[PDB]
Amino acid sequence: PVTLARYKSFSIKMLKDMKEGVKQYGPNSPYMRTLLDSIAHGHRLIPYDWEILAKSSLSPSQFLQFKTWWIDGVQEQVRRNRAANPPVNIDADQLLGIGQNWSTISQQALMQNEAIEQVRAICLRAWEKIQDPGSACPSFNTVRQGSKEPYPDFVARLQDVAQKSIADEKARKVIVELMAYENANPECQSAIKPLKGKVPAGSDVISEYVKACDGIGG
Amino acid sequence: PVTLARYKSFSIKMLKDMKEGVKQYGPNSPYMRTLLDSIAHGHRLIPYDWEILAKSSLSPSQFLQFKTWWIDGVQEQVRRNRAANPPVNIDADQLLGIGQNWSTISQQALMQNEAIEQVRAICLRAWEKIQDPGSACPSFNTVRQGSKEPYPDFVARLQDVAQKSIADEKARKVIVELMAYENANPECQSAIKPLKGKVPAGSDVISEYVKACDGIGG
Amino acid sequence: PVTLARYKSFSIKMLKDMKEGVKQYGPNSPYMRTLLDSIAHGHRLIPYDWEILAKSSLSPSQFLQFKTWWIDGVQEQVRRNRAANPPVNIDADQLLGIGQNWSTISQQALMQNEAIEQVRAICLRAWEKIQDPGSACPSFNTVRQGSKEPYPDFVARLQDVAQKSIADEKARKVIVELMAYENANPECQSAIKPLKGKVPAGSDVISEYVKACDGIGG
Amino acid sequence: PVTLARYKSFSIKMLKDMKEGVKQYGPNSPYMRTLLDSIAHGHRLIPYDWEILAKSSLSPSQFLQFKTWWIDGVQEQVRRNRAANPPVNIDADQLLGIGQNWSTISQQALMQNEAIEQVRAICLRAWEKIQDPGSACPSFNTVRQGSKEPYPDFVARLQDVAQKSIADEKARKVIVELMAYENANPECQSAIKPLKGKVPAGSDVISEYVKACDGIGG
Amino acid sequence: PVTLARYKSFSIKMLKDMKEGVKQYGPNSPYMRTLLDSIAHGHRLIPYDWEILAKSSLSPSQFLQFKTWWIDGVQEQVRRNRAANPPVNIDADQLLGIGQNWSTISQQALMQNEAIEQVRAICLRAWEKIQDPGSACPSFNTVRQGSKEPYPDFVARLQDVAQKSIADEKARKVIVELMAYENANPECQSAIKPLKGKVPAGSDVISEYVKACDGIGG
Amino acid sequence: PVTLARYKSFSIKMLKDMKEGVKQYGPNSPYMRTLLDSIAHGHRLIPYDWEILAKSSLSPSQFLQFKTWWIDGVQEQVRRNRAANPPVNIDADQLLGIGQNWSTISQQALMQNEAIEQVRAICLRAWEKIQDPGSACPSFNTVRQGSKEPYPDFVARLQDVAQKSIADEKARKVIVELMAYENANPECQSAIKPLKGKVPAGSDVISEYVKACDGIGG
């Protein structure tokens, strides 16, 4: 990063325990995601650092997948910058680090904050949009609760699989509301009959359910 | 964390152990209970730090419960904040870090002292209210002291559900002993019964209870 | 502790490997006992540090048991201080850290050496007087030696279990002398026939036996 | 340890590895043999330090044997100390740290140089005289070189019992080779026999013994 | 390594992790690929350092292959070195560190800059040309995309054998995509076929290939 | 070692991970051999340091074997120094550290570079000339290749066992050439028919074979 302008390479042990953690819990752990967010906002990065971090971390397949969704995000961001009002004087190759304006490590020491947040958002989104090994064609009406089942651990499996088959943030977050009230057992569904019929403002709909019907055990 | 404002992230070594401890022992070990507030009282945090720390650490089932109770405590707090004398000008989304004025790292570096401790106090209760993924939380009279079982281990199973299900602190310290020998082991209740009301000044009545009950099981 | 007056909190890794060691070998290991003695005499502690150390270490059951025997030791020490010749101007709440003379961390920075050794002896005794999981009603005349059995490893199991069922230091240390000469096999008992009949001074009675009859193998 | 007197304890990290090594290899590995005297010659110790270190580390069966031989060596030492010219004024309980003048940390900070090395020399022999908890120590002619077995491994099984059962150092270096080929493997004794008395100056005769014996087994 | 000449060795901790990583993952993980050149570009090495590092790390089967290709690259390099304009005066055994003038540590401290980078460039290719001890390296048409299998994992199995079997760098970047869909999965080839020649400027054609191929298997 | 003259003892963790590595992979690993070379050339050692390093590392059997081949190397080096032209004014006891010229640690601080390289070569050779547990009488015409066998992993087992039964460097390195061409399967032997009949200069004969016939897989 930069302090007051030079480059400082990372300490070696960070790559070691990062490789350890991704090897143990996959590239889409909730653990390593916020680890990436912490190391992202905690330092001032250039895209070549993102190249070293990505190539130093995964199998070759996930590395190239990261490269591809990075490329598509570059094109999307460039179209939105040219659609901006007024348009943004930021190209694609400044966002990728190829070309005689941005080839070297010393060239990228003099970027600006809009590029910082832009590469931050786009590489974070690139990490969010990776698949993983392990495949099964998902059908929503196959998973349901059982007797004496703890309520949040039931809805957690519905929470996690919802971001797989739906790209839109809104489309996945509306159907979990519907699948929550149906796939609940009727004794827990009995608790939501006043809550269903009046959705409250200043509040997440799932958040009201979990702190509503907590006392159903066995 | 802020300092004298730059937001420095945590170390990579700061979080791998934290991810280790939750799978090794759980979310409410006494070890991580005194580990969390050490960081909370040696540093000075913004709500996005907790957004990092919980999402990096919990399970998907636990993290949703954390987010559920986190926004739930805001409703109890903001009613206290609005009717104070003098009334303070702090709204809902200033707590949650959402909205136009609270969703960047540059924004959250510009907050006063009197917001921070409310975030700490609500986050501690949020961290305490998590359920383990083994089961749900049982009721009060669903669990009592077992037969041919030790005494002081089962009375430890009350203070946790007291901190879980009860808000007021001195209510917790008074419900437990008045639930202690009420459906306890009756052979132990013989020794326990003549000790009622024999408390000198400022001591745990449960202390002399387990002092008396030596243990007969095994 | 204090150097020349401030408070310094402990490093985090000490609690980590302490929790590791007690989890591996129990709270009454010979290992962790002298670890407690080393960290006890190696630093200048206040009772609130003992609270953090105890609560940061065990299951809830052992923590409250520690609290109880701590309380009983406070009462015993207070009775002996009032029985002292002349009596000692040291109360109970100075030894416990509750009350407006001794509530805060900064209040306990100005104690004196008699309180230091008093809290040292009494918390050490509190750790010595803990039980553990694992129960069996002990009967002394059930364990005995066998053929080709190594002599010190035979008497070690008699050494360790002797402090369980007897609180008095003298009563447990006299009966092991008797059980040593009887539960030995006659070929090793043959070696002690000059040693039995004249107990030597300046010497422990078991110590003479072990460096007497070492050469009985097989 | 003392310094320029304050008694600073060891680190917590100083002892966990020490507890690791005894269960990992034993009490008289060559590794901990050179580990112990390194601390003993880089620091300056009181007898209560050894009371800490042994009780933190050994088994209950080992610790009693250590305490047994520790007081046993005092009887051989104090006869040498009383009849010296000039006679030194150091008694029994000054060695053991017991009694009114030697049982506090404030007391043991007030000792001269000429006590310390005697404690070190007696403690090294005490640490050497421990028996492993697998069995007892066999006799001399109970063990000899096995048939179809390597040569130089079994001759290593003599120097340990020499240091165990013999006090005088140059007696140990002369008993071993005069016990070496006396009931060794007789086919190897054919090659060994014409090498007697062929030692030039200041070398191990056993060196040329294992030089000659190439190894026939397997 | 040299400095401002004394040859300082590496740390002991520098190499145990390196020995750990090869048995943990292999000789050409991406992790050690970016680990090696970090040392190679943060330090300045002589050929005897690589003699240390490979022999300390590989298997006996791997180390001989490394030594085999290491001397093999010298023949291609020295023909370039002899016919240059101006011709440089560097011979064979100056590369290999053998002979009267290059086989001591005092000798190799006396070399110029323009030798060093050739050693680095040849050693990287030498480290890349190693075969794993599971099997040998297969041919080109022995392996293609499998049936009911993911797409972008199997195309990763081409760039490695490209770097293995091909010397010229831009030949590698052009052989792979012209071998990509040639015996790939034909149902995927239906979507792949209309994308030929649609490359704007300076991008991976394989990127849009795996962009198109979503994945049908499983 | 020495910097500008004192002695500095090693850090304790170096002995720890050295004992770890030799315990895992034996004293004749390719790993630990170059570790010894790195720590050898990386520092300025005295023979007493070699004593501490050797005694701190192995079983007693390997330690005494090291001592013996050390002794024989002293005698060989002394005969060659007296056979030198002019002879070398370096004795045996300067090379061993016994005697009133070389008894102490402070005495060995003032050696010279010929002694440095002499003790380096001779202790390295002492480590090379150790046997190990695990015995089997070797016969060369028992091991051969199979179908689809990877060629370098076949010859690696012939490479490693060749230094066991032959002490001469030339005698073992000539017979592996013969056993290479015979014990190869005829399809790989088919590749060497132009290479057999003209051995190339500036090249190792095995090195040409491995980079000749690499493409025989299956």
Residue numbers in the entry:
A (entry chain A), B (entry chain B), C (entry chain A), D (entry chain B), E (entry chain B), F (entry chain A): 1 to 4, 23 to 236
Sentences from the paper on this structure:
CA forms the capsid shell surrounding the viral core that protects and transports the viral genome and also interacts with host cell factors that are necessary for trafficking, nuclear entry and proviral integration. Further, we assemble particles from HML2 CArec in vitro and use single-particle cryogenic electron microscopy (cryo-EM) to determine the high-resolution structures of four different types of Fullerene shell assemblies. Our studies of HML2 CArec show that an ERV retains the ability to form capsid assemblies using the same architecture as exogenous viruses. Analysis of the shell structures reveals the intra- and inter-molecular interactions that drives CA assembly into pentamers and hexamers and their association into shells that encapsidate the retroviral genome.
The largest structure is a T = 3 particle, resolved to 4.3 Å and contains a T = 1 particle within the interior, although no fixed orientation between the shells is apparent. Hexamers are located at icosahedral three-fold axes and interact across icosahedral two-fold axes. The hexamers contact both pentamers and hexamers through the CTD–CTD interactions with three alternating CArec protomers linking to T = 3 pentamers and the other three linking to T = 3 hexamers. These non-equivalent contacts are accommodated by relative shifts of adjacent CA monomers reducing the hexamer to three-fold symmetry, consistent with its location at the icosahedral three-fold axis. When the CTD–CTD interaction is with a pentamer, the intra-hexamer CTD–NTD interaction has the same structural conformation and specific hydrogen bonding arrangement as the T = 1 pentamer conformation. By contrast, when the CTD–CTD interaction is with a hexamer, the CTD shifts away from its NTD by 3.6 Å, the R143-mediated α6–α7 interaction is lost and the intra-hexamer CTD–NTD interaction has a structural conformation and hydrogen-bonding configuration that is comparable to that of the D6 hexamer. This difference in displacement is accommodated in T = 3 hexamers by the alternating shift-up of the CTDs (3.3 Å) to interact with adjacent pentamers and shift-down (3.3 Å) to interact with adjacent hexamers.
